[PDB]
Amino acid sequence: VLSAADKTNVKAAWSKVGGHAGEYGAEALERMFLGFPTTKTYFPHFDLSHGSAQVKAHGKKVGDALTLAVGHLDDLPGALSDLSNLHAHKLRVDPVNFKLLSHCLLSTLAVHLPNDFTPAVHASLDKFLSSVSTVLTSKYR
Amino acid sequence: VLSAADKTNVKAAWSKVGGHAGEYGAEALERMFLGFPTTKTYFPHFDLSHGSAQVKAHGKKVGDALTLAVGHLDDLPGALSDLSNLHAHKLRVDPVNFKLLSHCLLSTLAVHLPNDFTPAVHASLDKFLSSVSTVLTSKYR
Amino acid sequence: VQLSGEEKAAVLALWDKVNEEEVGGEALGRLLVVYPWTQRFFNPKVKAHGKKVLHSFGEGVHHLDNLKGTFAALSELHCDKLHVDPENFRLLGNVLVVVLARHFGKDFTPELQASYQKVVAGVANALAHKYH
Amino acid sequence: VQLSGEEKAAVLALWDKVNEEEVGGEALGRLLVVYPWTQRFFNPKVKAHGKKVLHSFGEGVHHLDNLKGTFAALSELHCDKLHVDPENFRLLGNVLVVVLARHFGKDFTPELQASYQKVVAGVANALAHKYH
Numbered sequence A, B: 001v002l003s004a005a006d007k008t009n010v011k012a013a014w015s016k017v018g019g020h021a022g023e024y025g026a027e028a029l030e031r032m033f034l035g036f037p038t039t040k041t042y043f044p045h046f047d048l049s050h051g052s053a054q055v056k057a058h059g060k061k062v063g064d065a066l067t068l069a070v071g072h073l074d075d076l077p078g079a080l081s082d083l084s085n086l087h088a089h090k091l092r093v094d095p096v097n098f099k100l101l102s103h104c105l106l107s108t109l110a111v112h113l114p115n116d117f118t119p120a121v122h123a124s125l126d127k128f129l130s131s132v133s134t135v136l137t138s139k140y141r
Numbered sequence C, D: 001v002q003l004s005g006e007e008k009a010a011v012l013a014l015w016d017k018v019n020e021e022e023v024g025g026e027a028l029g030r031l032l033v034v035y036p037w038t039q040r041f042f043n044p045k046v047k048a049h050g051k052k053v054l055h056s057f058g059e060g061v062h063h064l065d066n067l068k069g070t071f072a073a074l075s076e077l078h079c080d081k082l083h084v085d086p087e088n089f090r091l092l093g094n095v096l097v098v099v100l101a102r103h104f105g106k107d108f109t110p111e112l113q114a115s116y117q118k119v120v121a122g123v124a125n126a127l128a129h130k131y132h
């Protein structure tokens, strides 16, 4: 995330994700709901059935937010300032859930990009997700 | 740690710790070794008996490092740059151990400063210790 | 989990001095302030609920040889009804330890704390029992 | 822990396809790179040790109704001999899941992953058995 080498890897890896960011975000959400049933409690207003238009729509948003972050590795706190208010202040999301979603995103990237998901890239992406999660739980700073 | 309110609390609380920083650091180390035996593996070269001159000496160092940090809340990465190389690069300390030592330090402060260790101060100090721990495991950044 | 006869007696003797209302109120109060996401699950009722938490901990301390059975029902309550991630059981446990340290000062020696850390870990693990 | 008959069959059927050498080597290798503090405990021997880890996981997958007994000895090995903090058991488990996802692609469906997360949690908890 923060080391020059890590930023380079993150931007590179995300160029390979491309316009699939939204699709992967939606699949990562389904993996999280299935794998870790505790998380479902934050979405009482969603239809959580596979292929849900709500989950699809929400995955796209999550995907666009990450693509935004990758463009602003220099100033994550500023670029995601609004999102930290929502997650930590309004929703009070338990920080453990960010680790769970991050694991599910890495799993989804492994599934779709097996050749590009090298150990070096896996490492840099884990740091990236960890650094985003920090920002989004920043109200707990 | 980082919010203005938190920095104010941290500097205030540490003024009450005063010249006892070294003593408390040593006691926090004894609480950690006793409470969490896994940690002892990082000190094969220490005499780990209560009243050890080595533990006393090392507590003082730990105490001086925290007092240093409190004076540089603005630039923690720079002030503790050398310590992050030692902890994360040379020693490869498991990040969980920083949570354990931090709990043991808060326990020690509770023991000695029961009137000053208010919920507001406890909160700010937990953020402070968390932020120091981040810096010291920064090689894992 | 496994304590010696000496540790068990020190643990029990300190518990005779614990005001479950005042300790309970303070421990729950500090959880909410130090770990603000717990505010999703929860003032004069912080006191009332704090007291119930401590009364439950007290039951553990008196049934150290069967923590799983003691907290079976409470484990289901926290898992399927409330959906509390078990990491928070460990957090509350350490907050209780800090509170006991504050209340007992120098009597809460490094040795006695090490015993209470075993008990708090035992309790958290019994409450996580029907999750994982 | 508790799987249905259908989940158990999907779990077993995927394990028939797991090359313990290649998966083991890769999973241990990624642990060391992603979580660099694990380098304190550990190249052609990453392969050799990776293989032993996976062979042990395989034993769990075939003894799902008694994970505690299966890993009793290994639990003592990791606690009193090596002093490995149990958090790292959960980390290795998730790395193994990511590796299986990479190897099996679209066959590693959201449902199959959810089953493997149960198994990995079961295994990590059995290895932590004699710590806490």
Ligand code: HEM
Binding pocket: A039, A042, A043, A061, A062, A065, A066, A083, A086, A087, A091, A093, A097, A098, A101, A102, A132, A133, A136
């Ligand atoms: C990688 C970390 C995450 C990112 C990038 C992220 C992204 C976002 C974004 C962009 C929104 C706003 C949607 C909008 O207003 O357009 C949102 C809302 C939300 N997030 Fe997250 N999120 C993350 C983690 C989590 C976690 C771990 C949870 C809980 C399990 C969660 C639960 C929610 C909920 C309930 C909403 C509100 C949805 C709604 O208004 O319908 N998020 N998230």
Ligand code: HEM
Binding pocket: B039, B042, B043, B061, B062, B065, B066, B083, B086, B087, B091, B093, B097, B098, B101, B102, B132, B133, B136
């Ligand atoms: C609040 C977090 C910590 C602080 C402020 C801190 C402080 C320090 C300082 C200042 C030194 C250098 C002594 C010197 O060269 O003068 C040191 C060394 C060391 N630390 Fe830490 N430490 C922390 C956490 C930890 C943890 C969690 C462990 C492992 C359980 C650990 C293990 C060690 C070891 C083995 C040394 C080398 C001691 C020696 O050279 O004899 N430290 N620490």
Ligand code: HEM
Binding pocket: C038, C041, C042, C049, C052, C053, C056, C057, C074, C078, C082, C084, C088, C089, C090, C092, C093, C124, C127
């Ligand atoms: C780890 C030690 C804990 C113990 C021993 C404990 C014990 C209890 C007890 C005894 C009750 C009420 C039982 C009854 O029905 O009479 C309860 C309820 C409850 N607990 Fe916990 N608890 C613990 C931790 C937590 C944590 C960390 C949370 C998360 C914030 C939590 C959330 C709740 C909630 C929301 C209720 C329902 C309260 C109500 O309806 O007023 N508990 N717990």
Ligand code: HEM
Binding pocket: D038, D041, D042, D049, D052, D053, D056, D057, D074, D078, D082, D084, D088, D089, D090, D092, D093, D124, D127
């Ligand atoms: C969580 C899943 C794990 C499993 C199933 C597992 C299994 C094993 C097995 C089967 C052995 C050798 C047993 C024998 O004596 O034949 C072993 C040894 C060892 N393990 Fe693990 N392990 C796991 C995680 C870890 C982790 C996270 C670490 C920490 C870095 C670790 C550190 C070690 C070390 C240092 C040895 C001795 C290796 C040697 O002497 O070559 N293990 N483990």
